[PDB]
Design a protein around this ligand. Structure first.
Ligand SMILES: [Mg+2]
Ligand SMILES: [Mg+2]
Length: 99
RNA sequence: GGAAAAAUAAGUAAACCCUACCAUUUGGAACAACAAGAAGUCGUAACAAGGUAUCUGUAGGUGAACCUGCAGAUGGAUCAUUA
């Protein structure tokens, strides 16, 4: 089971990798960013449609210049995209991915 | 005789204190909401006889809605049965 293979997308400049910490509501969450900062993310209008996100998922996060404290949830990683990220050496090898 | 200074008595009374207030703003320890939205939590009170009909007053209980007592209203789920 999976949605069609598409290229694992990396953190471009202005984005950061993140892991979901707790659930807020109104389509919001607290994320731990691999920037090293906690932020409060809002979920994309795109993602609100397609991909349901939950706790401890690994997500890509589009950042904001002005408010660093808020960030936008960009895309969710499939656990395979994640293990691949670890392979590539983008995100640290000690991280908990749950199924 | 006139008359400056200086003094005198009573008054007008500014300003500064003490008391007690009113008005228009304002600083403030300590408390601390409300409306809107939705992919957080616990349950499911209400809409159907919401699965114990709701609802009003009151009173008591109580994670949460709510629950129970008494009197009341159909906005009721009855306009209606002496033989
Ligand atoms: Mg809710
Ligand atoms: Mg009470």
């Amino acid at each position: 089971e999976n949605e069609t293979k598409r290229e694992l997308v990396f953190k471009e400049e202005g984005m950061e990798y993140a892991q979901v910490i707790k659930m807020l509501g109104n389509g919001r969450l607290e994320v731990f960013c691999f920037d090293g900062k906690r932020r409060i993310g809002h979920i994309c209008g795109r993602l609100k449609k397609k991909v349901w996100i939950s706790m401890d998922d690994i997500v890509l996060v589009g950042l904001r210049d002005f408010q660093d404290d808020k960030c936008d949830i960009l895309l969710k990683y499939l656990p395979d995209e994640v293990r691949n990220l670890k392979q590539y050496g983008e995100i640290d090898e000690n991280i908990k991915i749950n199924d």
